[PDB]
Amino acid sequence: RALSIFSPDGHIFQVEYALEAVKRGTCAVGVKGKNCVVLGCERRSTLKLQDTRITPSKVSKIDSHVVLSFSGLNADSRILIEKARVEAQSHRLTLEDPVTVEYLTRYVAGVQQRYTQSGGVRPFGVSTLIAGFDPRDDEPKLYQTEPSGIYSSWSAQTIGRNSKTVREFLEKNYDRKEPPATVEECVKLTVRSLLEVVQTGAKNIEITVVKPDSDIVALSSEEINQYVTQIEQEKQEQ
Amino acid sequence: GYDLSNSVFSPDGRNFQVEYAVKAVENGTTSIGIKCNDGVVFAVEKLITSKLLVPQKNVKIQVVDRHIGCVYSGLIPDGRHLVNRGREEAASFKKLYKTPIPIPAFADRLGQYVQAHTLYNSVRPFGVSTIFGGVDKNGAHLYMLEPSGSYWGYKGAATGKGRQSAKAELEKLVDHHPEGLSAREAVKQAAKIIYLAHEDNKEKDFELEISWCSLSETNGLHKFVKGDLLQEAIDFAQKEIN
Amino acid sequence: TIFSPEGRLYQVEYALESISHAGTAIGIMASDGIVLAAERKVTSTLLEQDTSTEKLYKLNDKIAVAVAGLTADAEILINTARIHAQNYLKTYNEDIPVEILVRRLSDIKQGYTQHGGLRPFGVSFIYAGYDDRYGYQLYTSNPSGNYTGWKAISVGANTSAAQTLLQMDYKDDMKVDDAIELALKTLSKTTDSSALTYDRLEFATIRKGANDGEVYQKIFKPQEIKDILVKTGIT
Amino acid sequence: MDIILGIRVQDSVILASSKAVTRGISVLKDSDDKTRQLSPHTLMSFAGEAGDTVQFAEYIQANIQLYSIREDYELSPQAVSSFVRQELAKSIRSRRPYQVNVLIGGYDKKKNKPELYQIDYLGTKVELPYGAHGYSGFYTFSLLDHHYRPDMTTEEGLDLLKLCVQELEKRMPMDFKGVIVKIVDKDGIRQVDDFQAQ
Amino acid sequence: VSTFSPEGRLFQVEYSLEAIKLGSTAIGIATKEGVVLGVEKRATSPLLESDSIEKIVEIDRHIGCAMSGLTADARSMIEHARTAAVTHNLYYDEDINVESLTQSVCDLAAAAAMSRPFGVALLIAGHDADDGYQLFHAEPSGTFYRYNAKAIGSGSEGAQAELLNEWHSSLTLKEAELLVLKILKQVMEEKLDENNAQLSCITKQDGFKIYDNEKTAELIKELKEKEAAE
Amino acid sequence: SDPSSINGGIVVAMTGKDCVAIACDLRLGSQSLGVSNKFEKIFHYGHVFLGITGLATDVTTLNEMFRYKTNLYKLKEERAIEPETFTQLVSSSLYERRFGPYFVGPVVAGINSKSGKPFIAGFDLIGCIDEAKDFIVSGTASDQLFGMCESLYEPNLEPEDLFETISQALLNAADRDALSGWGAVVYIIKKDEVVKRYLKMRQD
Amino acid sequence: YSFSLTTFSPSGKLGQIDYALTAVKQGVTSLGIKATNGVVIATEKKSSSPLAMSETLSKVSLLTPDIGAVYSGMGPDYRVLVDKSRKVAHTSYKRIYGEYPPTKLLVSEVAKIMQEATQSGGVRPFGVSLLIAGHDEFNGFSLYQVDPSGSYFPWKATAIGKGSVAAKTFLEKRWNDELELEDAIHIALLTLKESVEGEFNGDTIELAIIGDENPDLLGYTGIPTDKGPRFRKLTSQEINDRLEAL
Amino acid sequence: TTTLAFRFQGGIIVAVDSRATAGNWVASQTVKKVIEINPFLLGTMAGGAADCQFWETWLGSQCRLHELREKERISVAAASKILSNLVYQYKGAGLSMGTMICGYTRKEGPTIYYVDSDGTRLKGDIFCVGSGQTFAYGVLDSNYKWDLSVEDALYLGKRSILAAAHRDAYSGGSVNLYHVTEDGWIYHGNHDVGELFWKVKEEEGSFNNVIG
Amino acid sequence: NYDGDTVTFSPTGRLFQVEYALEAIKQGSVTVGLRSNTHAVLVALKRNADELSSYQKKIIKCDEHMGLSLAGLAPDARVLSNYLRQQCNYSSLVFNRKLAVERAGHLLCDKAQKNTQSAGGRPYGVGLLIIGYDKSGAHLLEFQPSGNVTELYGTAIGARSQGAKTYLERTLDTFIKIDGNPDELIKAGVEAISQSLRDESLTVDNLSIAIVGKDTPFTIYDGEAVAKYI
Ligand SMILES: [Mg+2]
Ligand SMILES: [Mg+2]
Ligand SMILES: [Mg+2]
């Protein structure tokens, strides 16, 4: 049965509504520096007494040099991830070269697109921020995918609740002439942006940095807190 | 709401979509059949919508195998479908049993197929009624089948718009000739009855079409009435029409 | 399996509702074991509780789950659970890591969410399990196919109530004997009936006795519940 | 067939594989590597039918690499090998069986011990101190059975392999153009580029 | 999804066409010196890297196409279009005809054995020996038409009208370039610069070439000047 | 080419007074080349023992299979499977592959926890069940084993005596088989306890 | 119709299941009483005309020589369920272990059938509830009740359909854990009498028990491992003989 | 048939003969044993003519598809693994082919992969395939140096074929030369062996045993 | 209520969807067909969406001895002609026999019917005039998506068709006798197509003619070559 269909106004309601679920999902953001990309996200707080150690984190490795974060139904994402991971290995196996961030993106995008014109399947309630570095290259990559299947790259971008607000922060706090030329400042900027919505919180934010040649690392609750503090300071000093 | 989907029984146990199919039938040309002494004749009214029609070409009667004649009224295409399947159903019988399909047998085959289209809402019943029959190992047979898949054997049968006028005429024949009716007679008679029945559609000029299956006149095979024999009946009808 | 104008999955949301009307199950993760407790739905003097198993199920010798929802829907999910467990064992000759089993079970539920046109499963699970990589773990999966891990958690009837009581008395360095007590207390205060009685309880633990090495899953027998009850003082 | 030998000393596993690829009447290449790294602490060497050989290896690699990503964990050598046995055990009763034999040497970071697994094309798996496939065993086992000791150093084993490789070059009819050796230990997988003279 | 209206039109198809009207303007003009395809980028923010917007694609060396509507839907269509030109080259050792290529694409369109029609249209422009330079517009209906110039997307109504005026059977590649540029400018909400419009053309000698921002800018500029004349 | 004689190996099981015993050699070879001397052929799922001789890969597969099956059995029935029952399972599980079988010869031994009655049984590669109260033999040296058993065996032996008997039977029989030996293992099974002893034998 | 007909309603209810439960509620009453050395399940042979023949309607059925079932709700839905039940008894069991399955397992399987009806596309739940009684070497005697939801649970005694509540109540007072079969039969009869409207005798009642093994009903002598079936249906005469002792 | 491809400073040299036989019958002396996959990749023919001609022409297509999808020149490694994997899909069916996939890309440099219907894919510096292989190998092995010049290298390949065309009954006709560079390959003629043997003999002084 | 699918008869026994389909035809350009005893012509007034496009091809050759003119939903016409091409082909290959026009007609009917009796399908929405010369002379057939096929001396279908239909309805006695001379038959064919005009006069891009007969294989005359008929 055709669920995703056109309406008198030229919209595919299910796809459009798919986006709403994206908005309801927490925020995720990623900005790309001069030789790095960072992706930050705010943690869900419906109920608290969580065991942080194990809980499925928001940023995932597609391959040693490509990661993906998303905003939306947590379940729907897992699938996108698996399909992406499996395609990552397959590319390696048949092309003898790991995927480029673009390719991986276009893969993930097409998957979503497909769900928008297939019967018996509802679109994915998700948008992803995929980032990483092309094999044997240093130029950072940040890409965005939406339930429609549309995708593109961004110097910095965000998705999830209040994404509009923080998007704005970025629209003026990120200049394409001096991208955060240091891991530290790119982080700063992401945090700064994140603070504008997160609402003063340590464990509330998780920040992941991606450097060239499979160099990926998530900052611990405290490394972040240090940034938070220094940021509330460059706010209180006025 | 019990008339929107096919397989649905209404509170009175009627399948409305079937009955609607019947209406499509009524809105069509009239056709008849007259089981005679050793055969059957079929005839139908071909309405001539325009001079542009090539005369005596858009044949409507159809044969199944070599000994069954078929004519129906309604959504023409639905008829053809019913016949193609008839043909497949007849071949299948021959291939396995050698003897060409017995009319009772054939009818039931057509029956079961149509009845099947009143079992699922994913299908619409047939918008046609079929009169058909022929000669077999033991007698002539004439049957008529309605969209419900219901069918019975007849002495005479007719359907379509001129249905009542025609039935009336047939009723006369049965009471006046219980002995039988020679194929020749039944031919002219059908020609007549169609002419008569044409009055319920007395507004357009028509083209008669007759066929017969007779054990002495066509060896048990289904042939079309053409030439001398056709004209004879056309005139016989033009005669008693006034 | 469709979206609301608001961006919610009807059938999923509604499923969760069905669940909230189900007995309460609790899973409390201690430092040396995990407890699972569940209050049974609809009973009588005549129901045989002795030979009963309706909320606490063994998945593998190292993983057990507590059920809240349609018993039947549960069993289907369980059987397949038990199977994925064994498949992994055959393929690798190592017991399946809890998260792996849990994530797999979740993925099924999610399927019903995204395609097919079948009603989701009216069930939520609490998984108590052990493994050489993360030791003891407590997990929860609900109809949306979403899962997460906890230190203590509950499902079924009166979540907010119980959740609030746990958040209050739980502390990082707990011990099983204490978690058992806590479990009982919480159930005791969030019941919808007169008083907690053995006949209305299902209790089970996953401890790693110091005098050995392999984890031992003990599904409490009726008498033992009656006993563990007197001690904690519910009388 | 090609030579595939493996010997697990105390802190590592050493694998030696002939460097020759023969197709019919000529020797096409004298520098082949008949091994793939499954995980950073497990290696698998292989010998058998022309295409099946690499195809199987690469398939196994990919699948182990995928598990590594999906779970953020490195399966134990033991795991990795049970996985392989099963794949082979599945192919013996297929339409067209992969005619491949492999050795899997890995350092189990969890137990802190070296491990060597020998699995033939039929899915017959066995854990041993030293092993080989085909005829290689015939010439070397007598030597291994004689000089092997559990407490051998990486260096003692490399010499035992040397003595073994010597016997092969003496008594075996085909020229396998030498061997490539690799060691799997706690710090990873390295290639002893000094086995042409050590 | 296969239901007819009392007017005799397919609903989802008509609606599908509406979704297309919501998309970036795409324009193509067909001359005797080539065919130009130009599109409007339309970035949903200035953070977005304007170059990662692909709306003019190469189907084969002698065939390119511009798209407009729900662009993601067009992925499969390009894939198919490419595969088909290639496959045709494989089986016949020759270049597929633009028409055939197009027809092949449309042949895919009506296959309503994919839940809904494609919410996107294409301007397929190409050249073959037998029918010269050609421009085609492909609709999700499954129908396609050949035009001398055509615009689709949000600003297509005015654009088509202007095309009607500017086109005559004798423009030069440069001329058409300008017009596309022009008309692009006339219907774009934002001001036409080289980071938000894209031109491309296809010629016998050099085939399908997408213009590099720099070359485009030079034309944009060349346009501002020719326009600020009178 | 006969899969049942490539890897070689033998197993034998016997019953005594309130106990049963099941023993097997340890050689795993590839035709003439002995490859391992640590290939046990006896397995257990609870208090039920299954010895399997035959093509080693199938021996491994089948073992894995019954563990799997016996495990789910336990979860579903909440109790451990019994000898008689496991037997039917083995049989049916083998016949399931009647036209592309597992080249193996299983032997089952155990004591039913409820009746206390000793039980052993054996099958051919497709499920033909052999249920004798005396002894069961399987492997490349079945002939030798039968000969041994038939002469050495007598009913109602005590755990300690049956042990000698079955060891001898296994031992001597193996000595006359090229493809067996390199070690032997013996399980003495009683309702309550189970002792496992390795034997000293020629390593040729 | 490939989508679930039974969906979740906003209150969190499975419409069709509750309705099926309603259908069950209207059915004739049936009871099961588990003694120490047996179990009895009975129902009333609701003759829809005296022209019909009573015997030709087994409301109580043998699933395996040691397991019987009785129902409440739509007979047809039951009849097909018994067929499938006996079948799966073999396929998923006797053909794999050479012995019939244990009550809870069979029960579990039956449940599985009904659940599928609760979720598979294009069908409606079974409009029945069964009381399944049986015995097995390891779990002894048991009685179970199975619902259209698929839910099942064991009982010491219970009743379903029409006079369920009244009956359950009477059972609740007479049952104790020291009941000898004859007595539970007695009670079954007594409990039955109150829900039965007209004539109450051996031709309007149907009692079946699960007890000691009946060698006389085996059909052959020779093999001594299987001493016979435990399920035995009561004869008109046997029932009346007991009625007379009211 | 004799075909060789060897890697060097200036790129790749591919040289093949052009004789096809049906038993003792010389069917053609003018066969093209080098399948021009696309302007940058070269494939050689040996084994089944159809099998190579067909599947390599096809390979030519798949590469094109890839270059449209990714806007980047397909690597030889990739180019060859496609053929290779395809070939491995039919393993057992009876495909007969042994070929070199040659290409020179920026990323890889000059590259030669041997692929055959058995599923073998190998990377090497020198490869000869065909009934006349051993003869060409003989010449190649002794005069092969990486530091060779394009002119000499062409000759070396040309000669190695000559060698084989002389001794092997199933090779001959004429030699076809190809130099593969990073900007693509350049054809270096078709040289009739008849005329070539006499010339080389005279000039080089070899094949002395032959009278002329 | 009763016009949701073709599987629903209304209370008066009609199939609305079919009917609605028939209405799809009326919004297509007029196409005329007429035959004598030695030839069959198809004159189809082609249609344009703008003054810069192509006048959609209404005539398709189905075999060297048969073809058809379409009016309505092009896609469907393609599907139907193609099916017709295949069946013509099958007759040739398997029986080395030219498919009888009447036979072809029987086929289209049967094909259309299936789409007017099953849930999920949709009637075809295009009409066709099929001409073809065979063992029994010249033929002209009119096909309607309801599944009805009729053999006529002449006709036309589409927007304002009723004009030409009367012309022919009177000119019959005149054209049925245009044997041995194709030019005249065509002239008549044009003269007929003109009694259903209004927009403007038939132009050189407007016109599309197809002829077939005794010693003349189905040929499509488009543009230039029809000049002498205006
Ligand atoms: Mg034997
Ligand atoms: Mg021995
Ligand atoms: Mg020996």
Ligand SMILES: [Mg+2]
């Ligand atoms: Mg020669």
